């Protein structure tokens, strides 16, 4: 299995610099070009550049000259992209890819002067099939990762996109199971927030 492991989500201040990593495995690192691609929210894919670790050759598109610097470490099979002089326009998801076939999961970069805020997670039980809810509010920045139990109820899960009110993000998620599932079996809302390194489990319990 060819795999490309990209570094985790990043929060950086304007003017600062970040070094995104992409560790490769499952193939010969020095025999293929590693591609880097940018994607702003709701926008298309934008090619940044490429590196050939075998000999250190690099290619860039005009818009990303200076902004992006591509390097590679053969001993660790890791491709790096340094994004310098960061501005709000650099806030995006960045992918690494070997040619066209294999893609990393992407790294979300947020460029902001605002501080990290851990979310408050609330369980939402029904009023006094069944639908349960989980409220995640007052966090910064995106993203958060919400999952129900071990991701087995994902067939009936709707996790809604975060809304931004007063510089903080608020998210909610619904899970719909048959009435024989809950509260007979336990259902837990699992929320993770990398930027604040917070992981909280809230069990949906009857009111």
């Amino acid at each position: 299995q060819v795999q490309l492991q990209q570094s985790g989500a990043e929060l950086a201040r304007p003017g600062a610099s970040v070094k995104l990593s992409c560790k490769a495995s499952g193939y010969t690192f020095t025999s293929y070009w590693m591609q880097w691609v940018k994607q702003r929210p709701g926008q298309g894919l934008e090619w940044i550049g490429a590196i050939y670790p075998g000999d250190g050759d690099t290619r860039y598109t005009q818009k990303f000259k200076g902004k992006a610097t591509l390097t590679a470490d053969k001993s660790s099979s890791t491709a790096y992209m340094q994004l310098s002089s960061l501005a709000s326009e650099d806030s995006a998801v960045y992918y690494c890819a070997r040619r066209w076939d294999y893609w990393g999961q992407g790294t979300t970069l947020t460029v902001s002067s605002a501080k990290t805020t851990a979310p408050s997670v609330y369980p939402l039980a029904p009023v006094c099939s069944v639908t349960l809810g989980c409220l995640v509010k007052g966090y910064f920045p995106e993203p958060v990762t919400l999952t129900w139990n071990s991701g087995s109820l994902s067939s009936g899960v709707h996790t809604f996109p975060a809304v931004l009110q007063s510089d903080l993000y608020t998210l909610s998620s619904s899970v719909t199971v048959t009435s024989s599932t809950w509260p007979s079996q336990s259902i837990t809302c699992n929320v993770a927030h990398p930027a604040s390194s917070t992981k909280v489990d809230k069990k949906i319990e009857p009111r």
């Binding site: 894919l45 290619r59 992918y95 609330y122 619904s174």
Partner: protein, 211 residues
């Protein structure tokens, strides 16, 4: 540099129908040495990284369903989905793979049309923990409906309420092509406890009373 132009920008079709989208380049992508067109098709479903569909203009990647077919040569290329399924909801990008910089097209957004569907509404009073913290959010879910333009209305004690309401739609569903939205009424703990009845409606109505 090579400019990739995709058309249409977006289209909506019903499941089972055939779809053709275009990708044009400002220069030929045909490699003279091996007579292969270095054009690549990607599929990007909502919330996921781009997935390879077709490379060398017409060569399908392993795992990719046979209903996806790429064709064309030189400067004109087409992607065909012979029988669109609900899971085909995505944006489709073509990429110049012939010479650096490897430019992308602006993509073609594929959306799905389906029969009208009523939402399943559920309303949730503020949790005990949020109330203890001093806040009070009333959350309403409207799931699995179509089309997207649904009208959610709030009522407090029989009177219409609009202030403090934030709506949020999901992307179209990959399995049934329906939409879902959350509507959250946000007010302070004191503002919440000055009232009794809370109604969320689309008519499909869900409501509770603090007794």
């Amino acid at each position: 540099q090579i400019v990739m132009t995709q058309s249409p920008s977006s289209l909506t079709v019903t499941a089972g129908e055939k779809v053709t989208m275009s990708c044009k380049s400002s220069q030929s992508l045909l490699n003279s040495g091996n007579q292969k067109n270095y054009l690549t098709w990607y599929q990007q479903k909502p919330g996921q990284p781009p997935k390879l569909l077709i490379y060398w203009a017409s060569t399908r990647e392993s795992g990719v369903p046979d209903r996806f077919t790429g064709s064309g040569s030189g400067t004109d290329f087409t992607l065909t989905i012979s029988s669109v399924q609900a899971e085909d909801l995505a944006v489709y990008y073509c990429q110049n793979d012939y010479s650096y910089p490897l430019t992308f097209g602006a993509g073609t957004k594929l959306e799905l049309k389906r029969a009208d569907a009523a939402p399943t509404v559920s309303i949730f009073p503020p949790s005990s923990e949020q109330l203890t913290s001093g806040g009070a959010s009333v959350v309403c879910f409207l799931n699995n409906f179509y089309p997207k333009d649904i009208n959610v209305k709030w009522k407090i004690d029989g009177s219409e309420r609009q202030n403090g309401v934030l709506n949020s739609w999901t992307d179209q569903d990959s399995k049934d092509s329906t939409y879902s939205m959350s509507s959250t009424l946000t007010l302070t703990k004191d503002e919440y406890e000055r009232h009794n009845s809370y109604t969320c409606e689309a008519p499909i109505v869900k409501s509770f009373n603090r007794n």
